[PDB]
Fold this protein.
Amino acid sequence: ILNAMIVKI
Amino acid sequence: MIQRTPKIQVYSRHPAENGKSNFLNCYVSGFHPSDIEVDLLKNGERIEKVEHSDLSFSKDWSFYLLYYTEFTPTEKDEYACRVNHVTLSQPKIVKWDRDM
Amino acid sequence: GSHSMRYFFTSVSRPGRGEPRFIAVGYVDDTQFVRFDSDAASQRMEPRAPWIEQEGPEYWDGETRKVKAHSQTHRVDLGTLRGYYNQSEAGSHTVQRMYGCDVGSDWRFLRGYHQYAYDGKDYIALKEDLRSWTAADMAAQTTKHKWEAAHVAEQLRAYLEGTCVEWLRRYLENGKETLQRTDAPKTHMTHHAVSDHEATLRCWALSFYPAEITLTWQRDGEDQTQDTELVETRPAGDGTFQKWAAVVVPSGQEQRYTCHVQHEGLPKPLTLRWE
Ligand SMILES: [Mg+2]
Ligand SMILES: [Mg+2]
C-alpha cells in the first residue's frame, strides 16, 4: 500500500 | 534539463514461426522527457489494436514503455516500429529483424 | 531470496493544456501490481496483477484516496519548483518520485528509500539511515532545511520500516505462485557471417524471471569487451524477460569464444560455445 502522508516541497 | 534519446527494440514475445499467433513488441527505453509517440507498422501502415504498458522509469530516471500487438507472422509481411521524440530530428522507423 | 516493493510516480506539466499528467505504478520485485493514470476513465487505483484483485473495496477506496493525495501534492510541487528555478510557465517540466522497501530472505526489513527528481536529475533523497536528506543542488537545500525542520523523515521512516514491509509480506504470500518463483533463462546462440572474414555470434537468454541477469563473453577464458554488444534487458510481455549479447569474431576462430550466463534461477552458471 501507498504511504498515507505526502508532504509538499 | 536533460534530454535522453530512446533505445528501440522490435521483437516477438515467443520465437516466431510463420502461421503461429504471437505478440509483436516495441520496447522503448532510456528516454527523457516522457512525451513520445510509438506506432507499430504492418507493411508501412499503422496498426490500430496496439496496447502499451504504464509509464515507469529506471534507476537513472529514464523512462521505458512496451507497445505490443497480437499478430500472426507470415513470410511476406514486414513489421516495424515508428518512434517520435524531441531528441529525434525525424521519426525513427526500426524494422523487425527476424534473423538475429 | 530478497524482495522489494516500489512505487513510481511521474508528474508532467502541460502548459496551456490544463492539468498535469500524473501516473503512479506499484511493483513487487519485477512484477507490476497497481496503477493510476490521470488520463484514464476510472480515476481509481486499478489492479494489474491477479493476486491483488482479491483485495476488498476498502483497499481500493483507500488507495484511490491516497494516490489522489499524491497527485495533488505533485501538482503543487510543479509550481513550487518552477518558482525555485525561476522558470517560465511556457515549458513542460517533469517530477519523478520513487519510494519503497527491501526485505531479506528472512523477510525482515533490509533498507528503505525515497528519491525525488526534477527534469530527469536527482533533487532530494532520503539518506539510508532514514533520518535526514541529501539535497542535489542549492534549490533542493531549501527543501532539505524545510523537511528537516518539520521532521518529515520520521513519518516516512515509520512507513518504510513498518507498513511497507508488512504489506510486502502480505503481497508475497497472496501472490506466492507469481512472486515466489524463478524462471531460469532458456539459452542459445546464433551465428551469422558479416563478411568473408568475420561472423557475429549472438548469445540469447529468453523466458527468465526475475529481470536481473548477466551475459558476458570471453575469448580463451579472458573477459571480452572489445566488440561486445549488449542490449537492455527487455520484457517479453508474459511476465518474463529477454536479453542478448553479441561479439564479432574472425571467421574460423568461433571456438575460442564462450558466452557466460548468470541468473538466480540457474544452479550453476551456463557456458555456451559455438560448436
Ligand atoms: Mg533499474
Ligand atoms: Mg521529531
